Swiss-Prot record, chain A:
Glycans are attached at residue 15. The chain holds residues 660 to 695 of 938 of the full protein. The lineage of its organism: Eukaryota, Metazoa, Chordata, Craniata, Vertebrata. This is Glutamate receptor ionotropic, NMDA 1. It is found in: Cell membrane; Postsynaptic cell membrane; Postsynaptic density membrane; Synaptic cell membrane. Heterotetramer; the NMDAR subunits are modular and harbor tiered domains that function in concert to regulate opening and closing of the cation-selective ion channel pore. Forms heterotetrameric channels composed of two GluN1/zeta subunits (GRIN1), and two identical GluN2/epsilon subunits (GRIN2A, GRIN2B, GRIN2C or GRIN2D) or GluN3 subunits (GRIN3A or GRIN3B) (in vitro). Can also form heterotetrameric channels that contain at least two GluN1 subunits and at least two different GluN2 subunits (or a combination of one GluN2 and one GluN3 subunits) (in vitro).
Amino acid sequence: PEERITGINDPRLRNPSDKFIYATVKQSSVDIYFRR
Amino acid sequence: NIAVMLGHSHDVTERELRTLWGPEQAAGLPLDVNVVALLMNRTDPKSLITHVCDLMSGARIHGLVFGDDTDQEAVAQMLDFISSHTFVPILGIHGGASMIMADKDPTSTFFQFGASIQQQATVMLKIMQDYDWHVFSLVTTIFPGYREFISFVKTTVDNSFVGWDMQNVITLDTSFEDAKTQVQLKKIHSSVILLYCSKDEAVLILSEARSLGLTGYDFFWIVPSLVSGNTELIPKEFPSGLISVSYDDWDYSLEARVRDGIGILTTAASSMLEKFSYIPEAKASCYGQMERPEVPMHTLHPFMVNVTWDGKDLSFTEEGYQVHPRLVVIVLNKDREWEKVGKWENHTLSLRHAVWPRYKSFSDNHLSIVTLEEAPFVIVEDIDPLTETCVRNTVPCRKFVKINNSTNEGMNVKKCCKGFCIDILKKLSRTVKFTYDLYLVTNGKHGKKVNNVWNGMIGEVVYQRAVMAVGSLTINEERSEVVDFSVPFVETGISVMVSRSNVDQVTGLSDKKFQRPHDYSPPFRFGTVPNGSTERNIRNNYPYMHQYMTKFNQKGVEDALVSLKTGKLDAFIYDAAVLNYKAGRDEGCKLVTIGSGYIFATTGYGIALQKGSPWKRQIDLALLQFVGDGEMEELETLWLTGICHNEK
């Protein structure tokens, strides 16, 4: 019953969704890679 | 008070007409003041000193708004000295009192309203980055201010994130005969050249450089003022097309400059009376000086720095910098004149040329690709005001700005444009090295043979308006004959989609409910939007069901999907690729397609080209090579890959 995303490139996760939204927390130390 | 001195060396448009109105206007700052004027002749230090001293006999609480017409540099300095040891604020307007001098003594009061060299460099960097050239050299010579020029340029380059390429700094200072000049000239290889010299030095440098060949058809010179004079006195050896910036004199006349000066003086007096309630005089004596020390009574220094006029604001700061100068950018004309493109009014340039005219220097693969947005093949996105650019990868395709009413004749506004074909175009550009002039077409749709005229895309190809029309084109027999197409790169056809979310059985058009337009019982659908491949193929092959559902075409594809969901009829004969992408990337993958992609006729897509264009064979070679090197699979997996494609 568990179909959690395996890897960020998962099409459910890679393509935008609307059930749950990704959280980066304070936009630092991750935002740099995301803009990269 | 306030006296103005002139004398009409060239422009005799003065006499008593200049001494008209002024402070009266609608200004609410009246006192014992007049608009006294004076005329003069060519200036010499003895004559100038005597005249200003004589005017000091009556200009007790007054000032001077002197202007000149010659090019003698020392005029500004002498004016500065007089202003220093007289305590009478003054301004400079035309010509001689218009070149800004670097430093002024603190015990002085005058502010010419020219423009700082640093302002010129900033505007020039702005225009250069606006055209996205970045890489440039800084050849110069020895002349005062060159060092601060270079340092300011470097610091401004480094203090931003747009990534200028700094290289090839040349500062030749050893005459123009040795090998150092030759090697320095030979070393540079960029297309953007920035020079800085003094009149004849610049012309000699350009005369030397033309013999090397750096003056071809793809080079620029952005010389800062320097060789501009005050008229169209360009030297004959200046080839053409020299980019420059200078102070404005055609959008600003002296008749308005004098008015602005009068208003500034009156407003300063009003501020002083509102803050000190008393304005003294300094009409003791011009001669016989060195009889009194400093007296800070009603210094104009704090009463001018933040002064506007009639809404318009031109407040100065520290030196003669006016914060908001009316700088104008000009180019050399074919007939050896100066053009007028763009005006530095706000922080935005507001240029007039969408593309560069490619001026003839002395006495080739960029083309115009035309496409419009449709499907997950070309996507239109608005430009981003924040960090103004087209995101990171989207390319600036400029749409013809569309409006309503009679003002629909809009300009060519930029937009950020991507899709499933832009990546193919850019990789083809990488492998072929061809530029682009992509702009949105808004005249119709993909195109069809209606009334013996093609509208949109292919029509341009048949009307000498688009050599290439890449996009979401569909290969057909009539289109390929008139438009030079290409080998298919994707598979496309006709597929039937049904919203049966509330086993395939019959796949295709071999059934009693589809082939026969009549009988059956429930109202079915044959929705096919006009100006497309589906309707043309249906009417060419089986022109029987089209008449039954002629008045059934949906407006677009989003409203088509809405009508498919909103149950009135569950049927759509559309493209196999678009329908497959929609089914794969649907909300829950509810609606599906009948059959396992049994396309009616798998014809695929094609790439447009001009009739007899010299690139078709190379285009086919590149397409087949990229078919070979396992990369279009990556492109499909990145863009058109679904979420339920693996799901059963």
